[PDB]
């Protein structure tokens, strides 16, 4: 009767609904009883300190468990042959075959083999022993405590910031661009120049000696002379053995381009010069806005002045500054959309240009990292649109936004939704039509009648960057072009070698199968966008429920009248787009993984021939690669892939259980629960025990959420088991 | 493994005692009127 202390409507619910709804609404502080804006911003600030401390504890824990139980020192000697250890296993349910089967890694105890890539990352940035992994774990534990204390401190009465501080956009932007982005990029350049690069060249540099060991032989004198090019002289030779002095140069800031030939990773001096240049550019970016000394820009003035004189945007961006500063949901939507694009860039650029030494030879790690960050990207991208819908319902004021870009979006929302519906159908009809055409024609024994479109536009873009595989001879591929000649002194010799060796994932060769799957991805992106955009733009009202904004973001329906109004809320369009996000990331990661495992065998023609019809995807990807996974245990024994084999089935179970919440609805279950309530009250020796909360069926929205969570969890667990076990079992 | 007794001490406590204690005290807290 007092658990939802933030909600008097829930704390007086006499059913089990009070516990569920009180737990699911706990972090939505705007809706809690008696919430002011002052108290809202101060609780958000403190719970951001708590989240930061959670991230530092997670990193310290990974470092500690590798320092304690891993084989980092054995792996560092021979990184292509040793398998990295994540943590040890202590499970009293194990049998002796299981204990023996998981005793890999060169140690005497069962272990999980790490797919996170943290060994390659810590190796590349300097770590060599277990004791500096342990030193780093103690530092992160201290930082976690410092940020827990800072969160507690800024909730104390004198240290609680005012709303004027929280809405000083100009100062925050100056400090976050020049200090949080720019200065820390400059300091990371310093770490690479002072520690990581010397330890890539055999010389140990730590806190005990780093003030008496110069990164460069000349040493901070060419910098103070303008002879900056003296820091690029004598780079690492192509004979350099990473971690050792053999083949090593003395340069600290180079622009060689391409990959270190032995680690198959980007040069560390390129990475150091990248972070130096990024640091300088972002520090310059952080002097744009006016804080206290009269130079700089007012953000309000820039938004107010950008109205095109032709009048096509209406009043332009007048009043947008007020709405963005006041609305935290608008800020969340922008931050999540922006973050989602970056984690997709992270996934795409780290498989094609790997930065960690000896990575890209570990296929399980490459597959796991790509899959992980694309799934994070899809979640962030859905959340951005969800909080844009919450913005329109909750924070959008039509009288402060008269004839804005925002109001004019709502003025032609029907045009945007109808055009998105057209493009999705135009892509869907023809992509499914070409795939089904190829399927029937191959099935009837005639694959030469397939519709195989060459992806010439993307091949032309590859050739423009120097790929000499399609004979297009454009730009960098053309030896005598203004583009090729301009960069001949610097990046072009190294980059051309990297992009024209067929031994990496820089600009992978493409054909008709890549054309068809790129069009399927485009259809999935448009359809997921259609549901999310339709949800945001119809959030305030529609023709069925024109007063939809009075009811909120998440409500079950408007009842059976007017034809029926199930799934009419903007929350329900988040719900429907979550299935399409899962489908989209499914098509993307299935494509990445099949193309990469076929290249890793040397059998790229298996993808080239089987990807143009859907039976090739069914038998040559799912069915063919299932066999090491589903044989992880069998009546003849078990091996260390048994755990993924169990997780695979576990994933199939949760997913199917989600169907029960999504197909069967509340009225059935409430009538069952009433027969069980009767039976408990009438059964002797059991009616001595009484519920404090009346058992009720889950709510309509809660059941949609429970089915979505089960569906999504089953999706993630099944694919994770397949992508790790098939790559491990095959090793290629 | 160094301090090898630690998994055999901490895993039963973290996996059984810690949830049994939070379930018991959360149950008491969520079902009190005051």
């Amino acid at each position: 009767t007092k658990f939802p202390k933030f909600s008097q409507a829930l704390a007086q619910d006499p059913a089990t609904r009070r516990i569920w709804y009180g737990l699911a609404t706990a972090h939505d502080l705007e809706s809690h009883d008696g919430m002011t804006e002052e108290n809202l911003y101060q609780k958000i600030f403190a719970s951001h300190f708590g989240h930061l401390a959670v991230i530092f504890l997670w990193t310290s824990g990974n470092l500690f468990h590798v320092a304690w139980q891993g084989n980092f020192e054995q792996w560092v000697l021979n990184p292509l042959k040793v398998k990295p250890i994540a943590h040890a296993i202590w499970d009293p349910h194990f049998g002796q075959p299981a204990v023996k089967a998981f005793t890999k890694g060169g140690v005497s105890y069962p272990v999980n083999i790490a797919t996170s890539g943290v060994y390659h990352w810590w190796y590349t940035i300097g770590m060599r022993s277990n004791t500096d992994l342990y030193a780093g774990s103690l530092f992160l534990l201290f930082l976690a405590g410092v940020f827990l204390f800072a969160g507690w401190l800024h909730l104390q009465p004198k240290f609680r910031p005012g709303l004027s501080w929280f809405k000083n956009n100009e100062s925050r932007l100056n400090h976050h661009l020049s200090g949080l982005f720019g200065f820390s990029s400059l300091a990371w350049s310093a770490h690479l120049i002072h520690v990581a690069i010397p330890e890539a060249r055999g010389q140990h540099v730590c806190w005990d000696n780093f003030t008496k060991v110069a990164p460069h032989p000349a040493g901070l004198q060419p910098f103070f002379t303008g002879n900056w090019g003296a820091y690029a002289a004598s780079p690492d030779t192509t004979n350099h053995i990473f971690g050792t002095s053999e083949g090593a140069g003395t340069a600290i800031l180079t622009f060689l381009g391409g990959f270190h030939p032995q680690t198959q990773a980007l040069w560390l001096t390129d990475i150091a010069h990248h972070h130096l240049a990024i640091g300088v550019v972002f520090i310059f970016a952080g002097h744009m806005y006016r804080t206290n000394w009269g130079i700089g820009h007012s953000l309000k003035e820039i938004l107010d002045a950008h109205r095109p004189p032709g009048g096509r945007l209406g009043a332009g961006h007048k009043g947008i500054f007020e709405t963005l500063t006041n609305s935290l949901h608008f800020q969340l939507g922008l931050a999540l959309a922006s973050l989602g694009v970056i984690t997709s860039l992270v996934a795409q650029h780290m498989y094609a240009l790997p930065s960690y030494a000896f990575i890209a030879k570990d296929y399980v790690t490459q597959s796991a990292l790509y899959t992980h960050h694309q799934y994070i990207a899809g979640f962030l991208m859905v959340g951005a649109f969800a909080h844009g819908a919450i913005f329109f319902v909750r924070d959008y004021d039509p009288e402060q936004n008269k004839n804005n870009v925002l109001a004019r979006i709502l003025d032609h929302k029907e045009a945007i939704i109808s055009h998105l519906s057209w493009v999705s159908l135009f892509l869907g009809f023809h992509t499914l039509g070409i795939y089904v055409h190829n399927d029937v024609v191959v099935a009837f024994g005639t694959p030469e009648k397939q519709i195989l479109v060459e992806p010439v536009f993307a091949q032309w873009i590859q050739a423009s960057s120097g790929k000499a595989l399609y004979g297009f001879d454009v730009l960098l591929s053309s030896t005598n072009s203004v583009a090729a000649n301009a960069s001949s002194n610097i990046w072009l010799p190294g980059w051309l070698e990297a992009i024209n060796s067929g031994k990496n994932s820089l600009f992978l060769p493409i054909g008709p199968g890549d054309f068809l799957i790129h069009h399927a991805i485009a259809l999935a992106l448009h359809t997921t966008t259609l549901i999310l955009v339709k949800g945001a733009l119809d959030a305030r009202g529609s023709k069925l429920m024109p007063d939809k904004k009075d009811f909120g973001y998440a409500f079950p329906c408007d009842g059976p009248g007017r034809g029926g109004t199930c799934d009419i809320s903007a929350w329900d369009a988040f719900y429907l787009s979550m299935f399409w996000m899962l489908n989209t990331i499914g098509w993307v990661t299935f494509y990445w993984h099949w193309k990469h495992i076929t290249i890793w065998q040397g059998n790229a023609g298996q993808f080239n021939e089987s990807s143009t019809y859907i039976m090739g995807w069914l038998r040559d990807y799912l069915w063919l690669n299932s066999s090491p996974l589903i044989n992880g245990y069998n009546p003849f024994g078990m091996n260390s892939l048994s755990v993924w084999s169990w997780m695979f089935l576990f994933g199939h179970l949760i997913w199917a259980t989600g169907f029960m919440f999504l197909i069967s609805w509340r009225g059935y279950w409430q009538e069952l629960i009433e027969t069980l309530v009767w039976a408990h009250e009438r059964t002797p020796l059991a009616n001595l025990v009484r519920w404090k909360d009346k058992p009720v069926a889950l709510s309509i929205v809660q059941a949609r959420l429970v089915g979505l969570i089960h569906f999504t969890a089953g999706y993630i667990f099944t694919y994770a088991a397949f992508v790790i076990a098939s790559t491990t079992g095959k090793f290629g | 493994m160094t301090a090898a007794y630690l998994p055999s001490i901490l895993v039963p406590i973290i996996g059984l005692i810690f949830p049994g204690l939070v379930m018991a005290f959360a149950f008491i807290y969520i079902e009190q009127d005051e």
Binding site: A53, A67, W68, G145, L155 | -
Partner: peptide
């Protein structure tokens, strides 16, 4: 390798972090 005493140093600092986590959580809870 890591000694047990080093593990005990890690457990002390993680205990201090647990106490600060409780105090921040109680401040957030009010």
């Amino acid at each position: 390798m890591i000694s047990d005493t080093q593990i005990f140093i890690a457990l002390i600092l993680a205990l201090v972090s647990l106490v600060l986590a409780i105090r921040l959580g109680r401040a957030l809870y009010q």
